[PDB]
Amino acid sequence: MYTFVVRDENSSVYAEVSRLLLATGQWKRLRKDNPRFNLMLGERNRLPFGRLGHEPGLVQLVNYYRGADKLCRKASLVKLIKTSPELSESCTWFPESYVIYPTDEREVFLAAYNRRREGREGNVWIALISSEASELLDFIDEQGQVHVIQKYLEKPLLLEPGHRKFDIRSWVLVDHLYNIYLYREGVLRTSSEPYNSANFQDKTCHLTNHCIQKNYGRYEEGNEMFFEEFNQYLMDALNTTLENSILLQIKHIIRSCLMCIEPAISTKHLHYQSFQLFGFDFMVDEELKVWLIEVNGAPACAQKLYAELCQGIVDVAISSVFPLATSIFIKLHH
Amino acid sequence: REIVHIQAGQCGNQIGAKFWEVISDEHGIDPTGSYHGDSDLQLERINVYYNEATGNKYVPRAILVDLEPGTMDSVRSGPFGQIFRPDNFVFGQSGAGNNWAKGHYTEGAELVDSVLDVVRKESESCDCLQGFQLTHSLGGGTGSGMGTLLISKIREEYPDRIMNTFSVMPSPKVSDTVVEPYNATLSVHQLVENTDETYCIDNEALYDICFRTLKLTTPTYGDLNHLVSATMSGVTTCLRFPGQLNADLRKLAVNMVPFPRLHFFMPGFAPLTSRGSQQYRALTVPELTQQMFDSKNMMAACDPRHGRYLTVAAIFRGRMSMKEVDEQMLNVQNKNSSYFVEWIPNNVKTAVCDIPPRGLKMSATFIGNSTAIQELFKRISEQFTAMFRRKAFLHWYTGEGMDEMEFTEAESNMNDLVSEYQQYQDA
Amino acid sequence: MEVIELNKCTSGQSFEVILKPPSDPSLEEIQKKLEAAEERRKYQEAELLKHLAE
Amino acid sequence: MRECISIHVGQAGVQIGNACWELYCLEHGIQPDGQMPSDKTIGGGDDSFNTFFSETGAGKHVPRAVFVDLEPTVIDEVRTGTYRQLFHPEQLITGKEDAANNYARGHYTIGKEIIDLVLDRIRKLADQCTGLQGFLVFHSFGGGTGSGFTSLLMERLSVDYGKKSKLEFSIYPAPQVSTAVVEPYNSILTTHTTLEHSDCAFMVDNEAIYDICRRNLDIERPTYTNLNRLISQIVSSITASLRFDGALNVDLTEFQTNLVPYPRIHFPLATYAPVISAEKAYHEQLSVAEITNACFEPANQMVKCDPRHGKYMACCLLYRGDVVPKDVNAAIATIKTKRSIQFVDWCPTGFKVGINYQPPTVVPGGDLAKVQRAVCMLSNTTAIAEAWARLDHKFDLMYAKRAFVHWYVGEGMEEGEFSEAREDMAALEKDYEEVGV
Ligand SMILES: Nc1nc2c(ncn2[C@@H]2O[C@H](COP(=O)(O)OP(=O)(O)OP(=O)(O)O)[C@@H](O)[C@H]2O)c(=O)[nH]1
Ligand SMILES: Nc1ncnc2c1ncn2[C@@H]1O[C@H](COP(=O)(O)OP(=O)(O)CP(=O)(O)O)[C@@H](O)[C@H]1O
Ligand SMILES: Nc1nc2c(ncn2[C@@H]2O[C@H](COP(=O)(O)OP(=O)(O)O)[C@@H](O)[C@H]2O)c(=O)[nH]1
Ligand SMILES: O=C1NC(=O)[C@@H](c2cn3c4c(cccc24)CCC3)[C@@H]1c1c[nH]c2ccccc12
Ligand SMILES: [Ca+2]
Ligand SMILES: [Mg+2]
Ligand SMILES: [Mg+2]
């Protein structure tokens, strides 16, 4: 009879996990502040890692990797990629980015802004989306917090019919042995309104967030194209597959990112252990070149994929540590 | 650190004499007072309970008290009757007639000074007295009335010493008179204020164990006392033998009592055995742990699942894997963490002693400070109220100078104690 | 990289290696705390003996 | 030469003191009767070992140490132990009754009736010194004596010996070897009162030592003796620079200089390797690179925490045995590229290294195997604050209900001191946070 606690009520993913655990009849939920737990579904902020693994007679596991925030924050991700030899600086799959503080690498950003202007090539960026540096710096200083300036991919792959923009969300599970598992089911969070190349003011066809979009539901149910359809589209419209044209790059980027920070966050020889679910956001240009946009530390899932993914988490991340009385994951080997 | 033992009344002397009989055998002391053991573990902390005389004679640091000579004459003619210092036999002639007032205010007040002289004589011999332990019943007159009088006067002369008691609670299942709830309620009022540690030995529980579990059709007081002496030997083990912590009465109180008034403990024991009947099969550690935590093994008729454990002290006796003990005890806490309060971290401690009790290859004694103990005091309170609402049998007390108000006050304080235990059950 | 302050002897040796450069109460008051706490003890004990006196 | 006086308070302090001084004798070739054949200056001298051992005309070398416990039981075993002749009666001080796991009882009540005697017995040792550096104080956090009387002693020492340094070897409480449920109370209370009086304190979590003994010495249930012999090895590694010829950490002030840039943050993390079982039949001796790399494994630390998620302020490596600077530097260069070692911006990323060619001495019949080379790393990392976080959390759980508080109030302590102590700890956690993240 294993025990667990829940300290993030807003987690739609782990609300389903706690449900599945109880339904086995071999897992018992304790109160929030009960230290005698086997599993901790921790909070998103100020997770007390320091108090883990100090309970005699209890193997303890938490659903978060301490230090993984360096990968899952926009200012941190840029710094991580730029300073890490395994990634920096000729990184081919991450857009040119810079860290900017409100009134740092502001002078460095302008040095590159000149080449694009004194080269008469594409010079659109993103924090809002603009082609003028002055319009952007005035926006960051007016907000208050730290922002990141990034090169805007002016030539994205566009779905047909619709001439639409999209981004790919991949769910990745890293268990206690630092096995990197890619969920075989990803999702394309598509824009419904046709992509406009000239007018950047209209951020409804540039930004592909599920909330902003909610022409919603015209082409597919809820502006979400799964892999079977997207693969079929790539075969019919471009004479290729999702595996060859995109997924190899995706698996490569995921593998590379987590390998880089492994020695900093691994719980191999620690007194407590960690697993964590990541959500990688990718962007595809018209030449079928995959770009990493960012990494989310606390990702939500797609309604269709909750049942399968959440069950998947139990099998390889929880039951692997706490056994009870074909696979939906692709193991990215290293 | 010496302990001064006191036993008052019929019940107090009968379980008291049985206690000395049991531990004397454990420490290798014979009725003559001479040592005939084989292990040095027996004599290392024997000074806690025994005085040493010339020729290496060991005499219990015990004072026997009663208001009638009947029961104490039976002690002096009992098995280990001769071991006791004859000057420590302090008795009257009138008796108490199961009357708290007689024991506390009239008959006992006439004898209490004689007792305190013997307490003083014993204490002055101590290199460093740590405190006192009293054995008595709460349902009678002497052990209940005079016993609580002694406690109050001992506190007055030794306010910086620990007071411990083994208090036998009355039960209609094993009843002498109808006024036992009166005597008990009046006594609890005293114990709440003037003791640091009280082991609640419930005759209701003892009877149920003998009847339901031990399959004794008609249990006697002797059958009841087999469970008491087994329990008493257990809870005092860590005081009598060299252990990892070398426990004393004060350190026990500090670790067991989070709030001063909540110092009424539920004792437990495993395996439960009847007299004469020898068991041939030693219990495994998982069995000891499971049984000692079961309600059927509690010496206080309270359901531990109806409350939460504030603190727990446990002692395993016999040759066994202390690693296995640790795992099993940690397992109980990890399996049933809801019955342990979360605002007292690590509130369960376990010790182990190599020397097992007579007739058992291994045993486990349980000391629990549970909020479920309120069920005991509520039971007494109900029986108290049923009579007091009609002022029944009160003339036995007013005849000794008591007033009705003193009953009302005693009732209120025990009900307060109940609500105090209830307060932390929902924390 | 840079090893500095190398000091050697028969018993052993010591040195420093740099990888990268950077970027009370008085006796009075004590005796006052102890005695004041003693007064609180005396007060508690007196309240007990007064309660027992009643 | 400048002298150091060791003070051992409470059961933990005394019994650890026994382990250390036993080991000190074996390292210097001093026999139980106090005779040291190799010392050719009969009746005195000013060698490095005279820092800890004074000398009589009879050629007896006696520890500059005082043992104090409010209960006679533990020290009585020193009076009759194998090293009974080593110390003399005036060094072994005992009371009548202990502090009963109560800080207030050890600090206020019973501490008041013996504090003058102890200081007098300490003053006697100090009089035999030509240039006293300061004191090394051994005690527990959880004990009533170790917590209560220590804080009182440390206060008076700052008054009587204002110019002198004061170091601590403190035992952090662990449920696996618990003696009281209120050990978190005593820990917070003694830390608060002692903080401004301590220059550098080495915390040892019994949890870590207990598990190291189980994991690496294959001892299913470690005894105090098992724990202490391992601790004494660590303590010896730390004090070896005071007792032997060298040029690193040669005096007490240098400890604070090299390990403690910020005064309040004076708790360096100790990591030791290798710990090998004596009854391990087949053992491949570990190289300089292997033992040095082990200094960055949490499983070898005296306190379980994660230095990867903090920042370093200082770092000393103390080698004993077959070790030369070349192999150390080669080991460090490799480790640096493999592990996360972040120094604070206002500190140089570097290591102070000390080597003693004599390998670590093992107690005959002990659990530790002889090794050709060992190392103790002293790193002032903000990650050790995890221990304060654990402790302060247990404190809050009990104190929210004022559980067991009455025992302390009954000894004359004010309930306000609980909140005052906890506030100081809250500030300490903040200090670590500012420096660390
Ligand atoms: N490592 C180690 N820890 C010990 C030893 N002895 C006691 N402790 C620890 O010390 C804490 C309790 O403090 P003690 O030293 O035993 O008690 P004390 O200092 O004598 O204080 P009182 O007995 O209450 O007066 C517990 O957490 C024990 O685990 C020891 O020999 N070695
Ligand atoms: N460099 C770039 N070039 C082109 N488009 C970009 C871009 N960076 C971001 N986008 C677009 O902007 C959208 C939102 O940006 P961003 O990913 O920062 O927000 P977000 O945090 O909500 C993603 P998530 O919700 O998964 O965390 C992306 O979905 C993508 O559509
Ligand atoms: N366990 C036990 N309880 C007893 C014994 N004798 C009396 N009692 C209980 O004690 C109460 C009577 O008190 P008693 O000791 O006889 O009165 P006293 O001699 O004046 O103190 C009743 O509730 C009995 O159940 C005994 O030998 N064993
Ligand atoms: O030896 C001991 N001394 C103590 O203070 C006891 C203790 C109780 N709690 C402790 C806690 C911590 C540490 C020690 C103890 C947690 C809560 C209750 C402990 C003990 C264990 N089983 C026993 C059986 C009989 C008598 C004493 C004991
Ligand atoms: Ca000399
Ligand atoms: Mg009777
Ligand atoms: Mg002690």
Side-chain angles (χ1 to χ4, degrees):
Chain A
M1 188 60 60
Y2 308 109
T3 57
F4 73 95
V5 297
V6 182
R7 292 167 71 96
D8 186 18
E9 293 284 324
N10 296 8
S11 176
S12 49
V13 178
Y14 289 107
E16 176 62 24
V17 172
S18 64
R19 189 192 72 84
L20 288 173
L21 289 166
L22 296 168
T24 59
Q26 309 184 46
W27 278 87
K28 177 184 174 186
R29 179 173 175 180
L30 313 181
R31 308 178 198 178
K32 283 179 46 168
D33 287 37
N34 195 324
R36 313 208 70 88
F37 61 84
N38 287 111
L39 173 64
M40 169 176 166
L41 309 183
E43 57 268 51
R44 282 177 59 173
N45 305 123
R46 293 274 178 175
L47 197 159
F49 290 102
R51 305 206 310 260
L52 297 179
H54 295 279
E55 285 297 331
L58 283 181
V59 184
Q60 290 193 325
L61 175 72
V62 63
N63 69 334
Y64 275 101
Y65 264 101
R66 190 185 188 187
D69 59 275
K70 274 164 160 288
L71 186 71
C72 297
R73 299 299 195 276
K74 299 190 169 52
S76 300
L77 176 59
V78 172
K79 183 194 173 188
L80 174 66
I81 287 182
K82 277 183 172 177
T83 58
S84 302
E86 304 104 287
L87 310 178
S88 85
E89 205 284 305
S90 50
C91 184
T92 59
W93 43 257
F94 190 68
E96 187 176 348
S97 310
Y98 301 92
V99 179
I100 306 298
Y101 288 92
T103 310
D104 198 332
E105 48 182 348
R106 180 175 290 196
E107 300 85 7
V108 192
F109 161 67
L110 298 175
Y113 187 85
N114 296 326
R115 299 189 188 92
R116 305 288 184 185
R117 186 165 187 173
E118 304 313 310
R120 303 197 309 98
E121 295 301 326
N123 191 15
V124 187
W125 301 73
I126 191 176
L128 266 57
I129 315 169
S130 178
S131 180
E132 269 290 335
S134 59
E135 300 182 10
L136 297 166
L137 293 173
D138 292 26
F139 173 77
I140 298 178
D141 307 340
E142 192 171 328
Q143 286 296 327
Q145 295 81 339
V146 186
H147 276 78
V148 177
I149 181 67
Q150 182 178 59
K151 175 62 181 61
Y152 192 82
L153 302 182
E154 303 177 18
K155 316 202 79 183
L157 187 73
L158 302 177
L159 293 168
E160 303 293 352
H163 208 62
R164 313 139 67 193
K165 191 182 178 181
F166 75 98
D167 76 272
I168 300 181
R169 160 60 69 82
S170 296
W171 291 283
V172 178
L173 178 58
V174 185
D175 63 5
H176 66 288
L177 304 172
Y178 217 88
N179 290 325
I180 304 174
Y181 294 110
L182 172 62
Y183 186 20
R184 67 186 181 185
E185 304 289 353
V187 68
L188 276 67
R189 300 174 298 186
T190 70
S191 175
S192 291
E193 308 180 16
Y195 176 80
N196 191 271
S197 180
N199 181 258
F200 298 107
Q201 301 289 1
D202 181 88
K203 303 186 299 180
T204 58
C205 70
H206 287 56
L207 312 184
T208 61
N209 310 34
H210 185 276
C211 73
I212 296 177
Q213 298 287 318
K214 185 176 179 61
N215 307 78
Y216 181 91
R218 169 159 157 81
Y219 310 93
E220 64 284 331
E221 182 176 354
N223 282 31
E224 289 181 349
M225 184 191 302
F226 292 106
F227 275 2
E228 188 172 32
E229 177 176 349
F230 181 49
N231 180 68
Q232 187 64 245
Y233 168 76
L234 286 175
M235 287 190 296
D236 296 329
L238 288 171
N239 196 30
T240 185
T241 61
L242 173 59
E243 171 62 46
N244 295 13
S245 61
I246 292 173
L247 206 64
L248 277 189
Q249 290 171 86
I250 282 181
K251 287 186 290 185
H252 168 74
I253 293 169
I254 295 167
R255 202 184 284 112
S256 300
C257 286
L258 294 170
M259 249 67 260
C260 179
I261 63 175
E262 181 172 10
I265 69 176
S266 177
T267 64
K268 181 177 182 179
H269 299 305
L270 259 196
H271 39 280
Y272 75 88
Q273 249 101 39
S274 297
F275 70 93
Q276 186 171 351
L277 180 72
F278 300 89
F280 286 78
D281 299 334
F282 300 99
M283 192 64 201
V284 190
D285 62 7
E286 60 181 12
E287 295 190 304
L288 297 175
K289 198 279 194 66
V290 180
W291 303 82
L292 180 65
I293 295 301
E294 62 152 18
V295 191
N296 186 223
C301 189
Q303 292 295 340
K304 180 193 171 189
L305 309 173
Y306 268 94
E308 192 177 22
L309 178 60
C310 295
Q311 176 60 25
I313 293 178
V314 173
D315 278 274
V316 297
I318 296 175
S319 297
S320 57
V321 181
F322 309 108
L324 303 186
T326 308
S327 178
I328 63 173
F329 293 105
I330 303 173
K331 187 169 184 172
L332 309 187
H333 289 106
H334 58 87
Chain B
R1 304 298 297 278
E2 297 84 357
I3 293 174
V4 170
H5 171 95
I6 303 171
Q7 45 188 71
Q10 181 173 33
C11 178
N13 275 277
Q14 276 167 353
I15 69 173
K18 206 73 193 350
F19 164 75
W20 285 110
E21 175 176 348
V22 167
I23 71 166
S24 289
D25 174 79
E26 290 184 6
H27 286 279
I29 311 300
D30 54 31
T32 322
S34 304
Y35 174 74
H36 283 101
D38 56 334
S39 179
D40 279 18
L41 235 62
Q42 291 171 325
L43 294 173
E44 188 170 328
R45 306 184 75 191
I46 202 169
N47 275 323
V48 177
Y49 279 96
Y50 295 83
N51 286 322
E52 188 177 3
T54 312
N56 291 265
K57 310 289 290 189
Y58 295 100
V59 176
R61 195 171 300 101
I63 305 172
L64 300 83
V65 181
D66 204 338
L67 283 169
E68 63 187 2
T71 310
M72 283 175 57
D73 290 331
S74 290
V75 169
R76 189 145 38 193
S77 65
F80 281 76
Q82 315 286 30
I83 205 179
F84 295 107
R85 174 174 166 88
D87 277 14
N88 290 13
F89 289 83
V90 186
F91 54 90
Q93 295 288 348
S94 58
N98 293 306
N99 196 323
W100 192 86
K102 286 190 177 178
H104 200 82
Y105 285 131
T106 58
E107 303 297 338
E110 194 173 348
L111 188 69
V112 67
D113 286 334
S114 305
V115 181
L116 289 171
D117 292 337
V118 181
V119 174
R120 194 171 306 103
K121 185 165 189 172
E122 284 288 359
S123 292
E124 291 169 355
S125 302
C126 290
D127 188 43
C128 187
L129 172 71
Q130 49 167 309
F132 310 86
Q133 72 172 29
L134 170 73
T135 57
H136 66 152
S137 64
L138 304 194
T142 302
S144 187
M146 192 189 179
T148 50
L149 179 67
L150 268 176
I151 288 175
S152 184
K153 279 183 161 55
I154 286 171
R155 183 178 186 187
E156 193 176 24
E157 192 177 358
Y158 311 88
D160 62 337
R161 296 287 100 104
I162 295 295
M163 177 56 70
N164 180 73
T165 68
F166 296 85
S167 309
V168 178
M169 310 291 177
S171 172
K173 299 189 179 188
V174 199
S175 181
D176 286 16
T177 64
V178 296
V179 292
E180 285 168 353
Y182 283 158
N183 302 328
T185 302
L186 290 163
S187 287
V188 168
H189 183 356
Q190 301 291 313
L191 296 176
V192 165
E193 307 291 352
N194 295 337
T195 71
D196 309 296
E197 300 159 321
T198 293
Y199 301 97
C200 298
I201 303 175
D202 191 10
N203 271 7
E204 179 134 333
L206 299 180
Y207 179 90
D208 290 338
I209 291 169
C210 287
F211 184 73
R212 300 176 186 169
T213 302
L214 268 46
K215 300 309 182 189
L216 301 180
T217 55
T218 60
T220 59
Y221 278 132
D223 289 327
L224 264 51
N225 288 338
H226 175 62
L227 299 175
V228 172
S229 65
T231 302
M232 287 187 67
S233 173
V235 301
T236 62
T237 291
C238 294
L239 304 172
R240 292 183 293 116
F241 287 108
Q244 309 90 249
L245 301 190
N246 268 26
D248 54 48
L249 292 174
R250 179 164 287 109
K251 284 194 173 184
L252 179 63
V254 170
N255 283 326
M256 289 298 294
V257 184
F259 310 98
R261 289 166 54 92
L262 309 190
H263 59 261
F264 296 92
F265 305 150
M266 287 177 53
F269 192 89
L272 295 170
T273 65
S274 55
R275 273 184 299 149
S277 58
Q278 300 178 346
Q279 66 164 31
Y280 308 134
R281 186 198 89 166
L283 281 69
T284 62
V285 173
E287 286 176 342
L288 278 175
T289 310
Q290 191 281 333
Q291 290 181 22
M292 78 187 303
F293 269 96
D294 182 25
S295 63
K296 303 180 192 304
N297 296 69
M298 299 297 174
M299 303 299 159
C302 305
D303 183 17
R305 292 185 183 267
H306 291 171
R308 311 182 80 195
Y309 288 113
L310 301 174
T311 53
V312 177
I315 169 62
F316 289 73
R317 304 187 65 181
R319 191 167 300 191
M320 75 195 77
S321 175
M322 193 183 184
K323 174 182 176 182
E324 191 174 5
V325 173
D326 226 327
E327 290 174 354
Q328 289 302 314
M329 287 295 297
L330 288 170
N331 164 77
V332 166
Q333 304 170 60
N334 292 324
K335 266 218 189 70
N336 315 283
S337 59
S338 59
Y339 298 107
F340 300 85
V341 296
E342 73 286 357
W343 40 272
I344 304 180
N346 315 116
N347 59 357
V348 186
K349 183 64 179 185
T350 312
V352 175
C353 178
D354 294 335
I355 310 301
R358 166 149 297 192
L360 301 170
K361 283 195 69 177
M362 46 180 58
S363 60
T365 304
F366 174 84
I367 308 178
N369 192 345
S370 174
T371 58
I373 192 63
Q374 68 174 293
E375 293 190 333
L376 190 154
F377 299 116
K378 274 193 295 184
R379 191 186 76 215
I380 302 297
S381 188
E382 289 176 24
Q383 299 166 6
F384 176 97
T385 300
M387 289 185 299
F388 189 65
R389 62 184 175 177
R390 302 291 286 273
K391 304 177 179 186
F393 305 98
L394 222 59
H395 70 94
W396 296 120
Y397 297 84
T398 59
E400 304 298 318
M402 283 190 71
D403 190 274
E404 291 184 12
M405 272 297 174
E406 186 163 348
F407 279 73
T408 304
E409 292 174 3
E411 180 185 25
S412 297
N413 190 28
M414 191 164 69
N415 291 343
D416 288 340
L417 174 63
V418 163
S419 56
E420 286 181 41
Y421 264 116
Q422 183 62 42
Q423 164 178 357
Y424 298 111
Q425 190 171 293
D426 301 323
Chain C
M1 288 187 175
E2 184 183 6
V3 175
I4 60 179
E5 278 290 329
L6 177 65
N7 303 119
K8 303 179 71 187
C9 71
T10 309
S11 302
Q13 49 185 309
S14 49
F15 62 96
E16 179 173 4
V17 50
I18 304 179
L19 297 182
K20 179 167 66 65
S23 305
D24 286 25
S26 56
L27 175 59
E28 181 204 58
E29 300 173 59
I30 292 176
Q31 291 294 344
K32 197 154 288 178
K33 295 290 181 185
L34 296 188
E35 284 180 344
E38 185 183 14
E39 296 306 317
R40 286 192 292 266
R41 285 201 306 277
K42 286 174 144 55
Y43 177 74
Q44 288 171 8
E45 179 161 320
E47 287 295 275
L48 166 61
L49 297 179
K50 180 180 177 180
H51 175 270
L52 291 176
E54 295 175 337
Chain D
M1 187 280 291
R2 299 191 73 195
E3 302 85 342
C4 293
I5 301 177
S6 291
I7 305 172
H8 310 282
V9 186
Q11 172 172 309
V14 168
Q15 296 188 325
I16 289 172
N18 280 114
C20 289
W21 283 107
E22 175 186 29
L23 180 59
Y24 288 168
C25 284
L26 292 178
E27 287 181 3
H28 292 294
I30 303 177
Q31 300 180 324
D33 45 277
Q35 289 293 311
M36 182 184 175
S38 59
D39 184 21
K40 303 307 180 187
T41 40
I42 305 294
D46 59 343
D47 305 20
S48 286
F49 66 85
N50 291 126
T51 301
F52 280 54
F53 295 86
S54 62
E55 303 182 30
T56 67
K60 176 183 271 188
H61 296 51
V62 308
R64 304 188 186 270
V66 51
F67 293 72
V68 49
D69 199 353
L70 305 183
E71 168 221 38
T73 306
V74 181
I75 290 183
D76 278 335
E77 286 181 12
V78 180
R79 298 184 170 117
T80 68
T82 65
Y83 285 97
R84 54 182 174 272
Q85 310 172 41
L86 193 68
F87 316 90
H88 60 272
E90 308 226 326
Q91 305 179 261
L92 313 182
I93 313 174
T94 58
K96 255 289 186 288
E97 51 182 338
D98 58 37
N101 307 329
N102 193 339
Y103 172 92
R105 191 175 180 91
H107 183 86
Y108 297 98
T109 304
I110 308 184
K112 184 175 180 294
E113 82 182 2
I114 205 171
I115 181 61
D116 288 330
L117 171 61
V118 170
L119 286 170
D120 175 87
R121 296 289 181 82
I122 291 175
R123 173 59 63 178
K124 277 192 168 57
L125 291 172
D127 288 339
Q128 305 169 19
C129 289
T130 63
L132 181 68
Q133 313 187 39
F135 309 93
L136 306 191
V137 184
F138 300 74
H139 69 100
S140 62
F141 275 0
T145 301
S147 67
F149 185 73
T150 298
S151 66
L152 175 56
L153 178 62
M154 293 284 282
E155 279 184 333
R156 288 285 287 272
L157 288 181
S158 296
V159 175
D160 285 28
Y161 305 86
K163 279 186 169 63
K164 280 67 180 65
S165 296
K166 294 193 288 303
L167 271 63
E168 282 185 284
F169 292 92
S170 307
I171 303 304
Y172 177 102
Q176 267 295 138
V177 270
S178 61
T179 61
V181 66
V182 296
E183 288 189 62
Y185 280 174
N186 300 341
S187 307
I188 271 68
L189 288 172
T190 192
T191 294
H192 162 67
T193 305
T194 311
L195 204 61
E196 291 292 346
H197 304 279
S198 186
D199 299 305
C200 184
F202 301 103
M203 282 199 303
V204 177
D205 193 336
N206 267 346
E207 182 192 60
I209 300 297
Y210 193 88
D211 287 339
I212 287 173
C213 286
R214 286 169 53 182
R215 187 191 323 118
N216 296 335
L217 303 179
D218 291 279
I219 304 177
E220 291 187 9
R221 254 205 172 262
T223 59
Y224 281 139
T225 300
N226 297 128
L227 307 179
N228 287 358
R229 280 213 259 262
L230 174 57
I231 290 173
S232 58
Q233 286 290 348
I234 275 70
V235 172
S236 175
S237 296
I238 298 172
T239 65
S241 59
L242 297 167
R243 301 177 294 113
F244 293 100
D245 186 13
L248 178 66
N249 297 338
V250 296
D251 97 273
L252 291 185
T253 304
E254 195 179 333
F255 275 93
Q256 114 79 9
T257 302
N258 295 342
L259 296 172
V260 188
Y262 276 147
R264 275 175 63 86
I265 306 179
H266 58 255
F267 301 91
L269 177 66
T271 315
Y272 189 82
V275 178
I276 308 298
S277 175
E279 32 98 306
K280 186 182 183 186
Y282 173 52
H283 176 62
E284 304 176 351
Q285 296 292 343
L286 298 175
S287 68
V288 173
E290 290 175 319
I291 64 173
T292 306
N293 192 37
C295 289
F296 296 90
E297 291 293 342
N300 301 324
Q301 299 173 179
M302 298 297 97
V303 179
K304 289 191 184 184
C305 61
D306 199 338
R308 300 177 300 172
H309 299 106
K311 280 183 169 54
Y312 291 88
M313 280 157 285
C315 201
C316 294
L317 290 162
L318 305 176
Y319 296 90
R320 299 182 89 166
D322 177 35
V323 177
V324 289
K326 179 179 181 179
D327 298 331
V328 175
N329 297 322
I332 291 175
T334 298
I335 292 167
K336 179 60 182 178
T337 64
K338 276 187 173 181
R339 294 194 188 264
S340 306
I341 305 175
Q342 282 265 49
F343 273 73
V344 293
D345 292 329
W346 51 275
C347 278
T349 303
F351 301 82
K352 286 188 170 62
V353 184
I355 301 172
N356 196 279
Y357 294 152
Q358 184 179 334
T361 302
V362 290
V363 180
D367 307 278
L368 283 186
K370 183 80 182 181
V371 297
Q372 297 173 354
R373 60 193 63 80
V375 61
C376 179
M377 188 173 79
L378 301 177
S379 60
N380 194 335
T381 169
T382 57
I384 201 172
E386 294 178 27
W388 299 128
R390 290 163 55 208
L391 209 55
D392 289 329
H393 183 64
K394 287 179 180 176
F395 182 101
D396 293 339
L397 284 173
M398 283 190 290
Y399 191 72
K401 304 287 187 300
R402 298 300 193 277
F404 304 97
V405 169
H406 71 273
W407 288 115
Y408 295 72
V409 177
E411 299 291 356
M413 197 180 108
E414 276 179 10
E415 185 172 307
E417 177 167 355
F418 270 99
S419 58
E420 240 145 25
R422 180 60 181 90
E423 270 174 351
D424 189 20
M425 291 304 301
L428 187 65
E429 285 200 63
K430 259 198 69 178
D431 296 335
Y432 275 96
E433 268 249 28
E434 290 185 30
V435 178
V437 315

